[PDB]
């Protein structure tokens, strides 16, 4: 079950960024964002995931203030976690 503040499929920004809480149900291959092969991309290896926000599999994303994403998710702003 998702937290009460999970990003939902109906969120305008989630729709624009093609977020899904499950990267295996995402269009990461179509987008071909740079930095890793697409099949390797998900929130846990993204620069915007906030490891100090949330609990467990439900962590912050800087692009979704006040909400939580799933570490196993993906969106089209995926960017390699570089620091
Ligand atoms: S920006 Fe990164 S951490 Fe945030 S939802 Fe998209 S892939 Fe996940």
Author numbering: 1 to 83
Please give me the paper's original passages concerning this structure.
High-potential iron-sulfur protein (HiPIP) is a small (~10 kDa) soluble protein functioning as an electron carrier in photosynthetic Gram-negative bacteria. HiPIP supplies an electron from the cytochrome bc1 complex to the photosynthetic reaction center (RC) in order to re-reduce a special pair of chlorophyll molecules in the RC. The protein possesses one Fe4S4 cluster at the molecular center. The cluster changes its redox state between [Fe4S4]2+ and [Fe4S4]3+.
Here, we report the preparation and X-ray crystallographic analysis of the oxidized HiPIP at 0.8 Å resolution. The oxidized form of HiPIP was prepared by treatment with the oxidizing agent K3[Fe(CN)6]. The intra-subcluster bond lengths are decreased by the oxidation, while inter-subcluster bond lengths are not. The largest changes are observed in the Fe−S bonds around Fe1 and Fe2. In addition, the bond lengths of Fe- (Cys-Sγ) for all Fe atoms are also decreased by the oxidation. Our results for the difference in the Fe-S lengths implies that the subcluster composed of Fe1, Fe2, S3, and S4 is important for storing electronic charges in HiPIP. In addition, most distances between the sulfur atoms of the iron-sulfur cluster and the protein environment are elongated upon the oxidation.
